[PDB]
């Protein structure tokens, strides 16, 4: 009858023995290239035209569309818990603001520039980052100024984006993150900051590698998912043009790209961006009990760190600010 | 009143212009390091003790636990559609088979060895891969032979695993995939195949980098998620010990690791493993409409390819065998 | 040896035993600091034979230099010995070390940087030596510098140089300061 | 009872044997990438407005603030003992010289330019290096020309620094060492020397990596201690902009940085700068008997050499000029 067979083997080779390196819970921390701190997280903020706003957005999120009047009660618990940075997204709702040139982009009385002025007065501890694009301010909804019924007009889009970027910095934003993906915008935004004498105090956080996908919502310059060479050339371009830091978006599905950015842009801080759709997919899976949210969030976020990122833009900051306390 | 500002800029630099490289749908295929073919997919198969079985497993899957008697109706549509490989997982259910030495592992009349004998007679076109471990055959459920109430006994586990591996090859399995993660098993399995004169015809598909996570089920040698250095040393060990191919599991959350394996193990075929929990998380998200399954499956699977893999073990093969037809 | 040098064979054979005995008594990790050629291999082999290899982290003092940092005033690299330090780092990893130590640290930051590239996949550890610790304290009391200030600078230096672990006599303090 | 245990071991491997390489005192010299010569040391000199000066400064030093009238008796013993280079630091004391534009910086009758004229007449053997900055000549004490109650005005500071640098060279200084840390100063100083036809005879010794710390005194552009990527990009910038040599300051606490500069700037002479605070900390420790000064000075200074430097700016030159004799 069937009996357990045991082949004979040679003595163990030391080169085969890796196990003494990870056997204790502590050795598991010892084994990581970098550990998750609270000053690494960056919380996205969606500021509304309506100063009293605080409207729930939806997918699987727990994120809102707040207004300058509710902004102080929302950032207080966060700041006290250790939050050190936020990235600003303006959401102009008033019936007659959006246009073909994204005019409302640097509107001194828009959500963003008013979000900046409020934060720097009530939370001078917070590092202000601002997303730079025209998608949310143009009537068409594209990332830049279009040509008559066609493609994006590179020259006008960039020239426009440089202005918005310099205006946020002039209003007090410590950092501008351009997310248009339009060729050469980093150079013009950097040159514009230089001419505006704000280059030495505004960190240009480039979304160097922003891919298109089904991670933004079920269903303009944007790398195709298989585009690794373009992503690498875009990383290198953006650093040569002046970027002081780089962003990879999405992150979990593009970990190899963050690893590439970690070698191409070795001397610059890399940032991973946990996209709404990834966040909303972790939440869903969680509720369907396919996985445990806290468990899948630490795994996913340690992945950014392991892949090479030292900064993470995520909608899970509120939570993490809790969990890292533990 | 607020008017759109447009900074003045210098002429465009050619080095900033990448866009001519991705503007047409075709250029998006042109831009990929490698494209998804049907002979790249590997379908996992769970073979039951009960020869008539065909029991639905559950998370979000559409995968079953079939028996030798239903195996022909299940692989027919698949094989005709282009499926070229399968990886065998035996599931011994009979009330008195599991034990401390995983005796039933190479049981000539077990699910696996009978799954091999059936396939090689009804589908001699199919490439047979077999997972090699003792977790599913030991009373304790661990990946190897334990010590009296303690850790895993390296020597006995490996000596046991080498035997199971040589027995599957002797039964006709073209490839053995060891997934124990036990130090030096690749060497003993390779030596054992050599002594059994089966080394020149059995491809050792090593699960070189198998991390522990919440991707196997909501909630033994296994790399910790942040363990990049261990993963790299394990990749290099396994190739020096004889692996002919490598597997990274999970895949989507470990794309940077597949990218590392693509450089450490450059001359060997890399394989990504879309884990049950990732599969079950794509399905969930899909049904909650956070994303479109087909869309999120192509994105995720092209990610393996972009990250460096040329083979993919996924539960989405049935589907892909359809989609690639289109 | 009788009135002479160190007897490699007996020293190593002896050191392997001590190392396996600490592990058998419950020590999670053994750090060999003799600097004697091949001890890592025998200590690793001995742990293997004692079935304790998979649970004992061998933290090798791969690069231990001789200096005036141990006390005012046997295998030990000479301060200018960079090539030996690099070959010793590589030897110790091939022989089984799971982690590496560089001692001293502040005066050997370039060596920790070298270990960070030679031993890239292994945890590097810096060792703030008694004499460095005692020199930071002295300087402090003479007001040449501010202890907390010079301790963060020096210890961030280990981190910047490549270390992810630090053996220091300033832990009590740091356990306070990082709270802040 | 407890008896000495001796495990049995295998024969020694040759790859384990390094000891035959360092067993004799001579082999310890043989083992160094480079040895300390006297023409490697650079002695800092602090020249006072008061021509008869010779005021002891204090920390732990033995360095003074001399004046042109005492300069000949001070450099004589040094020069005869082998000193070949000095770096000039002007110290304007007269009650109404310092201002917002560092006007006195290139004052033809200031300490520096008069220190240059004196040395080139009494010691034409000496290589004259001059520190280039405005900190010691501006009323504010900052490294450059400020903006109205704010940050440093890049454009005016650099434009000013280029002039000072060209004026020292025009007065006879063989080398200018800019220590402001202001972005792009090397390029303007190099361009200015070119336009002044002095580029082919003035060595630009850039303080490429100057970090801020508690090593200058118990307690403007300056890299933060953990800033390795910035230090590396600054090293590369400065060489592309024209630096002929590089300086890393401080040195002992930044040995890894000198090692990085040794690879980034491989074809250029690297220089370590033993800072006042390090010098003053070696002296203190010495007097408290924590260590032996001569012993700790050779160790520390051989460290610069091992780390990659071929030049050392230190306050221990007088001593070394003695010790190397032995
Ligand atoms: Zn946009
Ligand atoms: Zn669009
Ligand atoms: Zn298993
Ligand atoms: Zn287990
Ligand atoms: Zn200065
Ligand atoms: Zn200052």
**B265 known ligand binder:** no
Cα dihedral D111/D115/D118/D124 (nearest 10): -170
Flag whether residue B228 sits within 8 Å of chain C, measured between CB atoms: yes
* Both structure tokens of D15: 């790859």
Distance CA C161, CA B176 (A): 43
Tell me whether residues C98 and A21 touch, CB distance under 8 A. Answer: yes
Q: Where are the alpha helices (DSSP H) in chain A?
A: 27-30, 71-80, 111-122, 154-170, 185-195, 228-240, 255-264, 276-287, 293-307, 317-323
| Residues of C labelled catalytic | 64, 103
Among A106, A215, A225, beta carbon nearest to B302? A225
CA angle A37, C62, B221 (to 5 degrees): 60
Listed in sequence order, the residues at least 6 apart from D295 whose beta carbon sits closer than 8 Å to its beta carbon are C67, C68, C73
**b vs e for B210-223, b when ≥16 Cβ sit within 10 Å of the residue's Cβ?**
bbbbbbbebebbeb
Q: Where are the alpha helices (DSSP H) in A70-195?
A: 71-80, 111-122, 154-170, 185-195
DSSP count for chain C of H helices, then E strands = 7, 5
Nearest to A248 by CA among A301, A211, A200: A211
Nearest to B59 by CA among B225, B290, B282, B254: B282
CA A193 to chain centre: 22
Bond from prior residue into B323 cis (ω within 30 degrees of 0): no
**What residue has token string 């490839």?**
B175
Distance CA A321, CA A83 (A): 7
Please say whether the beta carbons of D315 and C90 come within 8 A: no
Residues in chain A with CB shorter than 8 Å from the CB of D154 are 197, 200
CATH for D2-326, options being 3.40.50.1820, 3.40.50.2300, 3.20.20.70, 2.60.40.10? 3.20.20.70
Tell me whether residues C54 and B183 touch, CB distance under 8 A. Answer: yes
> Per this entry, what is the length of chain B?
326
| CA-based nearest distance C142→chain D, Å | 7
Subunits with at least 3 CB pairs below 8 A relative to chain B? A, C
Distance CA C87, CA C96 (A): 14
Q: Which residues surround ligand 3, an ion (CB under 5 A)?
A: B 133, 135, 143
* Both structure tokens of D86: 């000095």
Please say whether the beta carbons of C51 and D274 come within 8 A: no
Please say whether the beta carbons of B310 and B244 come within 8 A: no
CA angle D280, D286, D292 (to 5 degrees): 125
Distances (CA, A) of D255 to A208, B246, B314, C106, D12: 33, 40, 50, 8, 35
* Both structure tokens of A138: 């143009």
Cα dihedral C25/C27/C31/C37 (nearest 10): 40
What is the C-alpha R_g of chain A?
Answer: 22
Flag whether residue D251 sits within 8 Å of chain C, measured between CB atoms: no
Distance CA B321, CA A50 (A): 50
Nearest to D307 by CA among D262, D268, D277: D262
CA A319 to chain centre: 17
Cβ count within 10 A of residue D149? 5
Distance CA A262, CA A283 (A): 28
Q: Phi/psi of residue B136, each to 5°?
A: -80, 5
* Closest ligand to Cα D157: 5
Please say whether the beta carbons of B193 and B242 come within 8 A: no
Among C53, C164, C165, beta carbon nearest to A17? C53
Distances (CA, A) of B116 to A7, A281, B121, B123: 22, 38, 9, 10
**DSSP state, residue D150:** S
Please say whether the beta carbons of C61 and C31 come within 8 A: yes
Distance CA C113, CA C108 (A): 9
| Binding site members of A for 5-aminolevulinate | 276, 315
CA D28 to chain centre: 27
Domains of chain D, residue spans: 2-326
H or E, element range at D245: strand D245-249
Q: Phi/psi of residue A228, each to 5°?
A: -80, -45
Distance CA C133, CA C131 (A): 5
Mutate to test the interface with A, among C123, C126, C162 (most CBs of A within 10 A): C123
Listed in sequence order, the residues at least 6 apart from D73 whose beta carbon sits closer than 8 Å to its beta carbon are none
Tell me the sheet residues that pair with D205. D245
Distance CA C84, CA D27 (A): 12
Please say whether the beta carbons of D59 and C109 come within 8 A: no
Cβ count within 10 A of residue B325? 9
Distance CA C101, CA A319 (A): 36
What is the C-alpha R_g of chain C?
Answer: 17
Nearest to B255 by CA among B307, B323, B316, B301: B307
Tell me the sheet residues that pair with B54. B66
Distance CA A112, CA A208 (A): 22
Nearest to C115 by CA among C138, C87, C76, C75: C87
Which technique?
X-ray
Distance CA D326, CA D318 (A): 14
Listed in sequence order, the residues at least 6 apart from D324 whose beta carbon sits closer than 8 Å to its beta carbon are D36, D37, D38, D82
Distance CA B318, CA A167 (A): 53
Flag whether residue D240 sits within 8 Å of chain A, measured between CB atoms: no
* Both structure tokens of A128: 């202000």
* Resolution of the entry in angstroms: 2.3
Bond from prior residue into A36 cis (ω within 30 degrees of 0): no
Q: Phi/psi of residue A60, each to 5°?
A: -160, 0
| CA-based nearest distance D228→chain A, Å | 7
Tell me the sheet residues that pair with C27. none
Catalytic residue among A38, A210, A266, A294: A210
Nearest to B19 by CA among D160, D8, A230, A96: A230
Please say whether the beta carbons of A101 and A62 come within 8 A: no
**Helix, strand, coil proportions of chain C in percent (round to 5)?**
50, 15, 35
Listed in sequence order, the residues at least 6 apart from B178 whose beta carbon sits closer than 8 Å to its beta carbon are B132, B133, B161, B165, B185, B186, B189, B204, B206, B207
Please say whether the beta carbons of B117 and B171 come within 8 A: yes
Among B4, B162, B285, beta carbon nearest to A284? B285
* Closest ligand to Cα D152: 6
Q: Which residues surround ligand 6, an ion (CB under 5 A)?
A: D 142, 220
Distance CA A178, CA A193 (A): 13
Distance CA A139, CA A137 (A): 7
Q: Phi/psi of residue D128, each to 5°?
A: -95, 120
Please say whether the beta carbons of A209 and A271 come within 8 A: no
Distance CA A177, CA A189 (A): 10
* C145 CA to centre of ligand 6 in angstroms: 18
* Both structure tokens of D47: 């020249």
Distance CA B166, CA B176 (A): 9
| Binding site members of A | 133, 135, 143, 276, 315
**B143 known ligand binder:** yes
Please say whether the beta carbons of D66 and D54 come within 8 A: yes
Distance CA A126, CA A123 (A): 6
Distance CA C74, CA D23 (A): 10
**b vs e for A36-55, b when ≥16 Cβ sit within 10 Å of the residue's Cβ?**
beeebbbbbbbbbbbeebee
Distance CA D211, CA A290 (A): 50
Q: Please list every residue in chain C followed by a chain break, i.e. its C lies more than 2.5 Å from the next written N.
A: 73
Nearest to A105 by CA among A135, A85, A126: A135
Q: At what angle do helices D255-264 and C109-118 cross, to 10 degrees?
A: 60
* B220 CA to centre of ligand 4 in angstroms: 5
Cβ count within 10 A of residue C56? 25
Beta strand pairing call for B54-56 and B64-66: antiparallel
Residue by residue, DSSP assigns C103-144 as: ES-GGGHHHHHHHHHHTTTS-EEEE--HHHHHHHHHHHHTTS
Nearest to B253 by CA among A207, A291, A318: A291
Please say whether the beta carbons of C148 and C172 come within 8 A: no
Mutate to test the interface with C, among B209, B229, B257 (most CBs of C within 10 A): B229
* Both structure tokens of D250: 């401080």
* Both structure tokens of C16: 């392997």
Residues in chain D with CB shorter than 8 Å from the CB of C88 are 18
Please say whether the beta carbons of A200 and D181 come within 8 A: no
Please say whether the beta carbons of C106 and D252 come within 8 A: yes
Q: Phi/psi of residue A130, each to 5°?
A: -130, 130
Lay out the sheet containing C29-30: strands in order across: C29-30, C57-64, C99-103, C124-127, C165-167
**C154 known ligand binder:** no
Listed in sequence order, the residues at least 6 apart from A211 whose beta carbon sits closer than 8 Å to its beta carbon are A222, A223, A224, A225, A227, A231, A249, A250, A254, A257
Tell me the sheet residues that pair with B138. B99
Please report the sign of the dihedral spanned by the C-alpha atoms of residue D249, residue D253, residue D259, residue D264.
negative
Nearest to D204 by CA among D193, D212, D216: D193
Q: Phi/psi of residue A270, each to 5°?
A: -95, 145
Distances (CA, A) of B241 to A12, A309, D36: 12, 32, 47
Cβ count within 10 A of residue C9? 15
Cβ count within 10 A of residue A10? 9
Please say whether the beta carbons of C32 and C56 come within 8 A: no
Q: Is residue A210 annotated as part of the catalytic site, yes or no? A: yes
**Widest CA span in chain B:** 86
């Amino acid at each position: 009858m069937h009996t357990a067979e045991f082949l004979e083997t040679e003595p163990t080779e030391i080169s085969s023995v890796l196990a003494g390196g990870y056997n204790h819970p502590l050795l598991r921390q010892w084994q990581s290239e970098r550990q998750l701190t609270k000053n690494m997280l960056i919380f996205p903020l969606f500021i509304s035209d309506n100063p009293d706003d605080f409207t729930e957005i939806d997918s699987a999120p727990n994120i809102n569309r707040i207004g300058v009047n509710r902004l102080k009660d929302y950032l207080k618990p966060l700041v006290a818990k250790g939050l050190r940075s936020v990235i600003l997204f303006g959401v102009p709702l008033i019936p007659g603001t959006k246009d073909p040139v994204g005019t409302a982009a640097d509107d001194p009385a828009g959500p963003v520039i008013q979000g900046i002025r409020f934060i720097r007065e009530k939370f001078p501890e917070l590092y202000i980052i601002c997303d730079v694009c025209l998608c949310e301010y143009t009537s068409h909804g594209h990332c830049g100024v279009l040509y008559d019924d066609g493609t994006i007009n590179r020259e006008r889009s960039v020239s426009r984006l440089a202005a918005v970027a310099v205006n946020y910095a002039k209003a007090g934003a410590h950092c501008v993150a351009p997310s248009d993906m339009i060729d050469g915008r980093i150079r013009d935004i950097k040159r514009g900051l230089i001419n505006a004498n704000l280059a030495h105090k505004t960190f240009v956080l480039s979304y160097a590698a922003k891919f298109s996908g089904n991670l933004y919502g079920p269903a303009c310059y944007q790398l195709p998912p298989a585009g690794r060479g373009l992503a690498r050339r875009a990383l290198e371009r953006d650093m040569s043009e002046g970027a002081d830091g780089i962003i990879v978006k999405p992150s979990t599905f593009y970990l190899d790209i963050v690893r590439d950015a970690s070698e191409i842009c070795k001397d610059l801080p890399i940032c991973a961006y946990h996209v709404s759709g990834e966040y909303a997919m972790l939440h869903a899976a969680a509720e369907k009990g396919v996985v445990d949210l806290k468990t899948i969030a630490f795994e996913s976020h340690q992945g950014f760190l392991r892949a090479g990122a030292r900064l993470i833009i995520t909608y899970l900051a509120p939570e993490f600010l809790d969990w890292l306390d533990e």
